[PDB]
A paper describes a structure:
Here, we report a general and rapid method for discovering α-helically constrained (Helicon) polypeptides that cooperatively induce the interaction between two target proteins without relying on previously known binders or an intrinsic affinity between the proteins. We show that Helicons are capable of binding every major class of E3 ubiquitin ligases, which are of great biological and therapeutic interest but remain largely intractable to targeting by small molecules.
Surprisingly, while Helicons [name] and H318 belong to the same cluster, we noted several differences in the co-structures with [name], reflecting unique conformational changes and binding surfaces revealed by the Helicons. For instance, the side chain of Glu9 in [name] directly interacts with Lys30 of CHIPTPR while Glu10 from H318 does not.
Residue numbers in the entry:
A (entry chain A): 22 to 150
B (entry chain C): 7 to 16
The structure:
């Protein structure tokens, strides 16, 4: 037979926790081939690219998810995070901010985990001001 | 909490 896109995402999720980020990204890629219209495949592969320090690759997958779901709190948060590492402070804090009001409007039980990144991003900016 | 974000599909 051949695994479903859901099973490929699940296998990729396991390799991510397993710290095999190249392998996890490849599983997400095969999921995408089976069904290219599921946003979480892209955000999760982008997260792989952040860990591997391939920041352009992670930007692209975050942008692809935002085309599928412009309201994605997760895609904005990963996009904001990625831009923070590239010293693109002004972009990171804008995207991190939009994840915050989007999480507000959707009433999501995430926690102080977006404000934390937002504070650290804004005050890492004032260093290299 | 990178696991929580990873599993988040909403
Ligand atoms: C600490 C923690 O649990 N954070 C967290 C991040 C993301 C989400 N997202 C979804 O559940 C969709 C929940 C909790």
């Amino acid at each position: 037979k051949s695994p479903s896109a859901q099973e490929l995402k699940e296998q990729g999720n396991r390799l991510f926790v397993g710290r095999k980020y190249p392998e996890a990204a490849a599983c997400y890629g095969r999921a995408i081939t089976r069904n290219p219209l599921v946003a979480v495949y892209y955000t999760n592969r982008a997260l792989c690219y952040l860990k591997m320090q391939q920041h352009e690759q992670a930007l692209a997958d975050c942008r692809r998810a935002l085309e599928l779901d412009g309201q994605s709190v997760k895609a904005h948060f990963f996009l904001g995070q990625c831009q923070l590492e590239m010293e693109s402070y002004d972009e990171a804090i804008a995207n991190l901010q939009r994840a915050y009001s989007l999480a507000k409007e959707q009433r999501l039980n995430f926690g102080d985990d977006i404000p934390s990144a937002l504070r650290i991003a804004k005050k890492k900016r004032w260093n290299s001001i | 909490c990178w696991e929580a974000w990873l599993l988040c599909e909403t």
